[PDB]
């Protein structure tokens, strides 16, 4: 649970309440089926790997810098890297996985288009932050 650390940082990044952004709430259709169940712990590494990847990509944009605290984003990247690297090492090693990865990527595509559409408003950003926050917990717990 140095993943517990990643959520803690995301929490601290919050600037505005979702309750002032109720107009902007959105269902992103997180492809949850692709993780916890059936093909249990360990067969879902590559999917989880892609997730972290996508998150890292998302929060590295100059738009993300404009949205969130520069200091926290740093501690955040450190944390993502740690995981990103460990997961990659496993993927590299031995243990429709493509469909699963595709599903994750489509999910983040939807997230990105949502922000473009909303013109990266603080509210849009808050909605997204809250989602990732949730869908990350689901991925891992």
């Amino acid at each position, epitope marked *: 649970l140095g993943s517990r650390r990643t959520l803690m940082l995301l929490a601290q990044m*919050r600037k505005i309440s979702l309750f002032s952004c109720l107009k902007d709430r959105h269902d992103f*259709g997180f492809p949850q089926e692709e993780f916890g169940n059936q093909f249990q712990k360990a067969e879902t590494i590559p999917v989880l790997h892609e997730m972290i990847q996508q998150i890292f990509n998302l929060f590295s944009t100059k738009d993300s810098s404009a949205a969130w605290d520069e200091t926290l984003l740093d501690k955040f990247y450190t944390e993502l890297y740690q995981q990103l690297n460990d997961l990659e090492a496993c993927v590299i090693q031995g243990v429709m996985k493509e469909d699963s990865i595709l599903a994750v990527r489509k999910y983040f595509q939807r997230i990105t288009l949502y922000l473009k559409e909303k013109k990266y408003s603080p509210c849009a950003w808050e909605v997204v932050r809250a989602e990732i926050m949730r869908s990350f917990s689901l991925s891992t717990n």
Partner: antibody, heavy 117, light 112 residues
Framework: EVQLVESGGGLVQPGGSLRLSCATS????????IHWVRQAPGKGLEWVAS????????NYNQRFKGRFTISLDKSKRTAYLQMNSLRAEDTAVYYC??????????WGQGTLVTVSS | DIQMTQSPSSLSASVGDRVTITCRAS??????????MHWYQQKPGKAPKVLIS???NLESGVPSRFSGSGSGTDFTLTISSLQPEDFATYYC?????????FGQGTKVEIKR
């Protein structure tokens, strides 16, 4: 003024099949996710499936994965629930419901499905 | 997947009384910042009606006697001044992923 109208309910024998439809009106179609939620008489509420018209995502309660199919016709502003191999425990009022996210904003009046010989 | 247990199942109280219904999720339905648990009201022969969203956000048009608190796994609907028109069954549901599940419901009847 948002309005959800489910129809196609009635009587079927066990093992038979049915197709519920829900006709929507009064809002931009692609903005709401449409759900089916049922309720056995006297009993509690059970989520069946949802469909997202904006994208094309669907989700199912694992209980009904094999038998039930949700689908839609965007031109007709209508969502459908195809039920198969109906057991007697599928007797319930089937609500059509909508949401933008997390919680339900709108509902139909419900349509009663009775599975009996 | 996430199951929830309301208590009491059934309940009786006089008009004006304070009423408390609780809902217990089989696992956390919270982020450190938001709880994804909602409360509905179903009057007999009618579709449910959302009251509280995200554990404590009172929905538009709902009377102020209604309120929700809680986080993690333990949540509470409170009617502070029970009224005759508040006779109904009350359900909790979560939107912490899939499947979406409701509680078994809590029947509230008015003592007169």
């Amino acid at each position: 003024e948002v309005q959800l109208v489910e129809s196609g309910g009635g009587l079927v024998q066990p093992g038979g099949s049915l197709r519920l439809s829900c006709a929507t009106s009064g809002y931009t179609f692609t903005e709401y996710i449409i759900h089916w939620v049922r309720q056995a008489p006297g009993k509690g509420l059970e989520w069946v499936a949802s469909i997202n018209p904006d994208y094309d995502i669907t989700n199912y309660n694992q209980r009904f994965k094999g038998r039930f199919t949700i689908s839609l016709d965007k031109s007709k502003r209508t969502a459908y629930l195809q039920m198969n191999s109906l057991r007697a425990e599928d007797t319930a009022v089937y609500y059509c419901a909508s949401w933008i996210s997390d919680f339900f904003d709108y509902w139909g009046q419900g349509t009663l499905v009775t599975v009996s010989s | 997947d996430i199951q929830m247990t309301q208590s009491p199942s059934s309940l009786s109280a006089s008009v004006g009384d304070r009423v408390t219904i609780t809902c217990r999720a089989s696992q956390s339905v919270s982020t450190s910042s938001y709880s994804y648990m909602h409360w509905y009201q179903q009057k007999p022969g009618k579709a449910p009606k959302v009251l509280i969203s995200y554990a404590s956000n009172l929905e538009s048009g709902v009377p102020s006697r209604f309120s929700g608190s809680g986080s993690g796994t333990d949540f509470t609907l409170t009617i502070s001044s029970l009224q005759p028109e508040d006779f109904a069954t009350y359900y909790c549901q979560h939107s912490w992923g899939i499947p979406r599940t409701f509680g078994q419901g809590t029947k509230v009847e008015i003592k007169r």
